[PDB]
Amino acid sequence: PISATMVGALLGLGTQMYSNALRKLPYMRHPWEHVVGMGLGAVFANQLVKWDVKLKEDLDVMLAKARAANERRYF
Amino acid sequence: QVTPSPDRVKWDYRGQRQIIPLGQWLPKVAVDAYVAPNVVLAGQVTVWDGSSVWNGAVLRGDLNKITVGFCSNVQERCVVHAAWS
Ligand SMILES: CCCCCCCCCCCCCCCCCCCC(=O)O[C@H](COC(=O)CCCCCCCCCCCCCC)COP(=O)(O)OCCN
């Protein structure tokens, strides 16, 4: 379906084209750079998803400790 | 008397250079401007974004500045020159 790899590749390709356009160059001026951008975008999107999972995992434990410290009041 | 030189170039394999600098006067062409291959730009010439200079035109800025503005066109075999005053 719509995987992080595909979203990232599309974003990387879009980044290269947007960069070319901003510089008033043809969209496909250096195509190997478009390939590089697709690769980097895919890598970055996958890494972001994994980091999001890990971040939620750490926030869970930290909220657990906060809750325990708060519950110590009613002892 | 007409005394020739034996070393004068009869055939130049490079053809006519499109961009002719003149000291520090270097013609400036925008990256999104079309300049036909056989056009000659010399000296103080500025060709701006979206403009176009077509086959056989000559733009010689050796006495004053020459400017082709945004989205303007100088068409085939035009000659654009300038004077001191
Ligand atoms: C697998 C597809 C993607 C692979 C990309 C290459 C491998 C990754 C290595 C890092 C690539 C990063 C991007 C390289 C270019 C960065 C920007 C350089 C542009 C620049 O200003 O300097 C140019 C140097 O050219 C250069 O830097 C390029 C030099 C030669 C690289 C081009 C060959 C890429 C091969 C693609 C697949 C080949 C298939 C067979 C293996 C000089 O610009 P200039 O005067 O030379 O001309 C340009 C005409 N506007």
UniProtKB/TrEMBL annotation, chain A:
It comes from the Eukaryota. Transmembrane segments: none annotated. PANTHER family: EXCITATORY AMINO ACID TRANSPORTER. This is Excitatory amino acid transporter. One of its GO terms (cellular component) is cytosol. It comes from Arabidopsis thaliana. Coiled coil: none annotated.
